[PDB]
């Protein structure tokens, strides 16, 4: 099987560097080097993310889409930056304006064809394609607009292969932009109707989870990114490993989406202990479920405790008892019968790889489909209206060839999306 990553925008891009920083080491691939793999198993399934050309050069099969040179020229001028074949860099030296409209209708719409071109060169690579990974932020141009287009096109070209989306939904407390809800509401819209698996991460849900669950005092972006990339590795790549009970994107999809919206999840990693001290090793297993299922530790902003779950997928990856795994999951399902929805006898989807995260003994990625994420699109949707009402920075959109009915559309859509999700919380 296979997949082809997609680094839309700067963020989605910045993260690319971290997702590939990791993944590679979790596959023994040095900058341009080959497979130094401490083992021999980190190779029989690599294909999922690379391509064979030389014999020591397995190149990441991702796409780097962005209308701001400097960015990709920071990712390509640093560490692992020199492993991507230049063909991968689909830049847009234009003005990468922070407008969803500027990267979806006017500026991005041009650079698109020169992207799809490659997304096809990579898809028609070889063997059988599974789906595409998509990273980006719903709070900017090259991210929400142009990346949200990249998919609307992808999903017309292969409505068969899957589409996981890793979105950095606009953090609450403080937004890293001003129109944010504009660029956001507009991209979520496109999401709820193309990709079929979205993993929403919040820069501040991370800080928290990174400053209190990792006594880490100076959580640089690199970190946040690093933590995130840690989860997306547990998801995909991982399951493309052996296991007593293994799954793969689809299983994950076909066990997690009760209703076609596409629904968005909230990823959570397992061993998340501070370096030295904490290295408690309390990782027998009840310790991992202890972790994963708590409020804090959910990369999302919202707290599960604020709304039932529809599905859950503990994708563990480290030798354990299909008994102490299958078992724990249960008590968990009974101690919290309250929030776990009922019309699904077994919400949880236990998954079990074998080999764990390179240096760790036992981990377990969590992919939750809780109704709690209602209380986020609400947020976003609110911010919109409060500012849409006055058409705040709307001239930067319309003046870019947009529509007063376009914004209406998205909000509503994504706004209805909130509605539905409640239809199950009850």
């Amino acid at each position: 099987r296979e997949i082809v990553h997609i680094q839309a925008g700067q963020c989605g891009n910045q993260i690319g560097a971290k997702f590939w920083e990791v993944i590679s080491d979790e596959h023994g691939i040095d900058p341009t080097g080959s497979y130094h793999g401490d083992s021999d198993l980190q190779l029989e399934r690599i294909n999922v993310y690379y391509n064979e050309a030389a014999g020591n050069k397995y190149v990441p099969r991702a796409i780097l889409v962005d209308l701001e040179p400097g960015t990709m020229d920071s990712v390509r001028s640093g560490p692992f930056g020199q492993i991507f074949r230049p063909d991968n860099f689909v830049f847009g030296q234009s003005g990468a304006g922070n407008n969803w409209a500027k990267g979806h209708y006017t500026e991005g719409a041009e650079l698109v064809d020169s992207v799809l071109d490659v997304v096809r060169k990579e898809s028609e690579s070889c063997d059988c394609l599974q789906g595409f990974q998509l990273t980006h932020s719903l709070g900017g141009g090259t991210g929400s607009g142009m990346g949200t287009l990249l998919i609307s096109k992808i999903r017309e070209e292969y409505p068969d292969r899957i589409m996981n989306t890793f979105s950095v939904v606009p953090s609450p407390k403080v937004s890293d932009t001003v129109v944010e809800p504009y660029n956001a509401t507009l991209s979520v819209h496109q999401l709820v109707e193309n990709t079929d698996e979205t993993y929403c991460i919040d820069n501040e849900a991370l800080y928290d989870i990174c400053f209190r669950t990792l006594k880490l005092t100076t959580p640089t972006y690199g970190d946040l990114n690093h933590l995130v990339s840690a989860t997306m590795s547990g998801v995909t790549t991982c399951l493309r490993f052996p296991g007593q009970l293994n799954a793969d994107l689809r299983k994950l999809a076909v066990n997690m989406v009760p209703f076609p919206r596409l629904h968005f999840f909230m990823p959570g990693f397992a061993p998340l202990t501070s370096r030295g001290s904490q290295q408690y090793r309390a990782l027998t297993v009840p310790e991992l479920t202890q972790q994963m299922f708590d409020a804090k530790n959910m990369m999302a902003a919202c707290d599960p405790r604020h709304g039932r779950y529809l599905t859950v997928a503990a994708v563990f990856r480290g030798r354990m008892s299909m008994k102490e795994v299958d078992e724990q999951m249960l008590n968990v399902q009974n101690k919290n019968s309250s929030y776990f929805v009922e019309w699904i006898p077994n919400n949880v989807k236990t998954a079990v790889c074998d080999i764990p995260p390179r240096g760790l003994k036992m981990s377990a990625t969590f992919i939750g489909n809780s109704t709690a994420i209602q209380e986020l699109f609400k947020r976003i949707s609110e911010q919109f209206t409060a500012m849409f009402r006055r058409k705040a920075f709307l001239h930067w959109y319309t003046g870019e060839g947009m529509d007063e009915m376009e914004f209406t559309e998205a909000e509503s859509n994504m706004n209805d999306l909130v509605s539905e999700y409640q239809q199950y919380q009850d």
């Binding site: 003005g95 001003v178 946040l224």
Partner: protein
């Protein structure tokens, strides 16, 4: 990628020489042009040894541009790029815009079309002018004017030094500034503002010195500006393009004018004291005594701030220091704006003049923003105008220079809707 710059008016040129100084100073390029892309968005690698500037200089009296071609830096620019009109400056808009200023413009443009070509996919022109002057108000007025048409497809961020609230110089100043605002308004992308007087306070209160030479205020803006282009167009952990600004900074087409502010302003001689915390500098940003503008947040609700940091800064430190702020409430942000905080993080710490009077910290915050505050500053400057116009005062000086009762009265009405604009976009929910 790049951003040309047109320093217009003696002042815009003095400030220019300054901002231009700080530059090489933090790029290891001696005044001889030679250093031993990155920063190419402000310097062209002409010949095979040098670093010819990436801007131009426009004054109608030679005096001031002359001094540049005397003092080291003399070697820095191209003999060509420093435009002059031996003729007369005239502290009057009209003459500088219409009558005289006209003659030079072509030639002026030519360079910003000759320098705009040589490059590689540019982003815009950082314009440097002094609102209340002759060559600075008038001229530019039509320079930016002729730009908005020749390159509507770019950024027009004009960095102005608008009229000291009580310590103005020219007798007419307002005539010249109500006129540079109305003519440039429909042409700029984002107009940065640095108040000459409100900067003195900083030199008195936050650095201590009753001996502030113009050469200092210049070192200051010369700093805040370095935080804009220089370092930003320079790689970092959270890059921010020029476009980025206007996008994340202007809510509405009016060439909106944010305010420049810097965090660490502390005098050398203090240079040894234990440095300030990420939290303190952040907080210093919300103090109306450190903002290079006599527009004390007397009520003006911020509506978007671009916190450009530089030096050793942990993104969480920021995505926390800002969080703390977002909840101080006494800092009331506009309604229609959930989050209006563009966090720009650079790497390389600031770079203080070897021995001026600037502390020299290992991190700073050049936060700029649009604040419903200027509702004031414009008001107080508009009123001025009327008083004189109300009696025609120095009107005969413009009329006789190819202007009319029109341009004045019709540029007054102009700003009028700038007093209503900056009022409506705020104060209301």
């Amino acid at each position: 990628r790049e951003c040309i710059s047109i320093h217009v008016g003696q002042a815009g040129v003095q400030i220019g020489n300054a901002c231009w100084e700080l530059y090489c100073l933090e790029h290891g390029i001696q005044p001889d042009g030679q250093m031993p892309d990155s920063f190419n968005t402000f310097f062209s690698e002409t010949g095979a040894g040098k670093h010819v500037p990436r801007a131009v200089f426009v004054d109608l009296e030679p005096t001031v541009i002359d001094e540049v071609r005397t003092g080291t830096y003399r070697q820095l620019f191209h003999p060509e790029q420093l435009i002059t009109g031996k003729e007369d400056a005239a502290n009057n808009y009209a003459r500088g815009h219409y009558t005289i200023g006209k003659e030079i413009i072509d030639l002026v443009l030519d360079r910003i079309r000759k320098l705009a070509d040589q490059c590689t996919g540019l982003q815009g022109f950082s314009v440097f002018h002094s609102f209340g002057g002759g060559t600075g108000s008038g001229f530019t007025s039509l320079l930016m004017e002729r730009l908005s048409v020749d390159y509507g497809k770019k950024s027009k961020l004009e960095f102005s030094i608008y009229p000291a609230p009580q310590v103005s110089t020219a007798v007419v100043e307002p005539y010249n500034s109500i006129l540079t605002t109305h003519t440039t308004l429909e042409h700029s992308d984002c107009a940065f503002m640095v108040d000459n007087e409100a900067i003195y306070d900083i030199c008195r209160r936050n650095l201590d010195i009753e001996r502030p030479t113009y050469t200092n205020l210049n070192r200051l803006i010369g700093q805040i500006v370095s935080s804009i282009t220089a370092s930003l167009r320079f790689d970092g952990a959270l890059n921010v393009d020029l476009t980025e600004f206007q996008t994340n900074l202007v809510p509405y087409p009016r060439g909106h004018f944010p305010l420049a502010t810097y965090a660490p302003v502390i005098s050398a001689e203090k240079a040894y004291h234990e440095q300030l915390s990420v939290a303190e500098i952040t907080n210093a940003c919300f103090e109306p005594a450190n903002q290079m503008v006599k527009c004390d947040p007397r009520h003006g609700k911020y509506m978007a701030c671009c916190l450009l940091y530089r030096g050793d800064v942990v993104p969480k430190d920021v995505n926390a220091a800002i969080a703390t702020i977002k909840t101080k409430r006494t800092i009331q942000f506009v309604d229609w704006c959930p989050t209006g905080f563009k966090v720009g993080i650079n790497y390389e710490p600031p770079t203080v003049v070897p021995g001026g009077d600037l502390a020299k910290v290992q991190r700073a915050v050049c936060m700029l923003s649009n604040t419903t505050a200027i509702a004031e500053a414009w008001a107080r400057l508009d009123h001025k105008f009327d008083l004189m116009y109300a009696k025609r005062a120095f009107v005969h000086w413009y009329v006789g220079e190819g202007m009319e009762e029109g341009e004045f009265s019709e540029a007054r009405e102009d700003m009028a809707a700038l007093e209503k604009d900056y009022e409506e976009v705020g104060v209301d929910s």
